Amino acid sequence: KERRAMKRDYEEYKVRVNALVAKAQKTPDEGWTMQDGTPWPGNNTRDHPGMIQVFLGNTGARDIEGNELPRLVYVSREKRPGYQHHKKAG
Amino acid sequence: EPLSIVYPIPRNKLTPYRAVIIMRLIILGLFFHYRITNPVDSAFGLWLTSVICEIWFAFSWVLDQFPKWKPVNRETFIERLSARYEREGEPSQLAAVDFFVSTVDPLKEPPLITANTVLSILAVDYPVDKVSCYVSDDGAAMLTFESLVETAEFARKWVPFCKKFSIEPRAPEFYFSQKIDYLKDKVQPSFVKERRAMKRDYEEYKVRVNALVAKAQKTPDEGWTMQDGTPWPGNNTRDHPGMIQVFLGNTGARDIEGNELPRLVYVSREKRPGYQHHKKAGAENALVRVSAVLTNAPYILNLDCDHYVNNSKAVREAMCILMDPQVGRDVCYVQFPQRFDGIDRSDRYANRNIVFFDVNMKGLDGIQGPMYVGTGCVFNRQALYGYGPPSMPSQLSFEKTFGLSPVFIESTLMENGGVPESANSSTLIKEAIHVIGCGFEEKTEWGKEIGWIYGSVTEDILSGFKMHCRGWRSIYCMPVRPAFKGSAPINLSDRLHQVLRWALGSVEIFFSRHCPFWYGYGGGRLKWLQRLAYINTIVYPFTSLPLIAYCTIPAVCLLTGKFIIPTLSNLASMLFLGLFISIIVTAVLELRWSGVSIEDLWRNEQFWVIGGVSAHLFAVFQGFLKMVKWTTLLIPPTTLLIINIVGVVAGFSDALNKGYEAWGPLFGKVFFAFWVILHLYPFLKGLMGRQNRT
Amino acid sequence: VVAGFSDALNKGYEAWGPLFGKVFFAFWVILHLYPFLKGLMGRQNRTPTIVVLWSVLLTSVFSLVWV
Amino acid sequence: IIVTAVLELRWSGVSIEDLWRNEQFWVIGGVSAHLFAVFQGFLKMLAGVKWTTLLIPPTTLLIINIVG
């Protein structure tokens, strides 16, 4: 009974990633804008200030039952012209 | 701006190809000097037979190589066509199309396949106010009529679902039974929910059709009766008044949402004893006459009951060439390649037949155009009537050339098409019923010079030849998607019969009045390089007779003679070496530009030889006398195998008379007989075998 | 290798042991790098025409050099 | 031996490859399985095996043949 619902939910979730990719295929002339109504901080691949964010942390979303889940961190470095950035070691 | 472009070979792979063939001709000519200045080989009889047989092969190659000169390629776009003709604001300015489907018997061919084909036709990507469908059945049957009613009911749900999600293919039977991941590029949010419901509905519909088919296995003693409470008009297969009906029309059933769907028409002919009815040639003519009275259209499309549409944009692609103001002035029809599915990886019997389509058709497209095959073609209405290409220099005549019906005579006068005075529906129905009489084509020219031509079994070849003789032109199309798919024979019994049927038709045409040898010369208008292409297609069967003679020399020589040509005098070695290398170099160059794999070329050659000694033989002798069982067709091939294997082994035994060196010809005859038992071995043994050949 | 054979077996007798060793070494060399270097071309095997091509090339070269 | 085999196939309906499979299978079974079975029954009569050892007889015959 739970397996059938889980399969249906996975398929529904798998459709939305394809939808997102299809939308992202084409870029606007001015640039990407966030949902809140502000421009995406990184508009140039070779120039973007560093960013850090935390999702699904201890103080935040909780499971349906009411328990907690491991925290997740997303980090993006800072790049400026005129320097060398080693691929993986850096 | 142009709607389509045509470009030739990039010229990098063209000049070497021409240079190879031109040099080959000189080599062949010199080789015959040696074979004519050596009059003795210890047996005059063998010498006389060998030289004559070889000369024929040279002529056959000449008639087959030249037509492949000057290949050409084409391309088309669809975005520009929509912008130009379908600009918003005003209504569409596109042309109308018509479809024809022919059926004969319900029991011999299952009705489920026919139902799937009908559904596919109604799901095309074209305005619903233009397309139309027609269905014709020769033998009246209640199952076909009842099956169509069920299909129409299910079409209400099937149509809107396909259009919204743009799914392909649009045939439920051939679409659901696919293992390709169906969640590949879909982006709609509610695709899964609707898909589950549709699958359940299709299964229920399938069960209903099965029950209906099984119900009619028995026949009531009194006879079949309709639901309303009246007898079925056609109770005798050889006698039934013609019937006409309309389903799913503009004024009738509507989609669930509230839109309209293409109209469907069901028509049956009239048959009476004491008259001869042509098969598949009078049926097409009858449909054309009926369609003109009901709904005139400028184009006609023909299809079988097995093939189905695989691409939803096929109609637009075909229309993008015929509607071009410049290149579309002189075009009779557009040919589409035919493809088959459900084929194993190892095509033993070469059912796909790619060499002819991917090589011969492209080469012949350069002169005038391709050849009519029978399915997948769009025919101009004016061309069928036999008027003539444009831009080129009484009632009694019209009555005697077309018929006695006045409505049909006045219909052809329309520049575009339609109903002239928008009369009541009842009168049109009565006229349509009256214009399908049994003895309507008594004093008319139908068949003789108008429409489909009666006579030979392979009437499609004959019909195309007459049209081309008046200066018309044809075009070839090769979309990325197949756009058309059908079925192919599985067992060898059907394949051998299929080859035998084609050969007989060619023989009949040769001995009839419509012979290219002395037909069409008056008035010209036919390119001299295509008349040669026509000659080869008509005289190909006769090439089988010398072929059997050549295959007999190796055994006879190896038994008693053991000598065919004199030993080389230091001059034939270079000539022999030049001959062998020449064939190799031409083959590789053809592969380089043709794109066909090397393996498939070998299969075509192997299949050709076997198919000649079995059926093509009968067509020339059974037909000479006429102007066979699976066991009986296999007789001539079996005889060659036994003779060429018992003789070759015997040669080795008698070779023990000499020493370790038996003078060289052993390898001379060993690879001469290997060739015979290298191309004919894998089929005769392969087609029967026992199992696993171990 | 083939040409070597066509030479040695023409005249030399009792001197075909070193020929056998050389042929064995050549076969050892050839076997390691024929399969991978060949199979990438074709679907499974182009033997049908390859065998006849090699045979005709061999016989033609032998006859031409013999002349 | 050849003509008789063909006629049997014609009416029995069996296939030739099945006949060959059975014939050669009978040979191997006789060497190993039945040899030990005949001997084991002789001991209890007068009185009143692992997989590894079962293959010993077949192994010996193969080695002596190839070396000889």
Ligand SMILES: OC[C@H]1O[C@@H](O[C@H]2[C@H](O)[C@@H](O)[C@H](O)O[C@@H]2CO)[C@H](O)[C@@H](O)[C@@H]1O
């Ligand atoms: O003869 C008419 C018949 O031709 C078929 O193509 C043949 C071709 O005519 C023949 O020269 C060649 O050897 O074989 C192909 C088929 O593999 C065609 O397919 C038929 O539709 C047509 O009726």
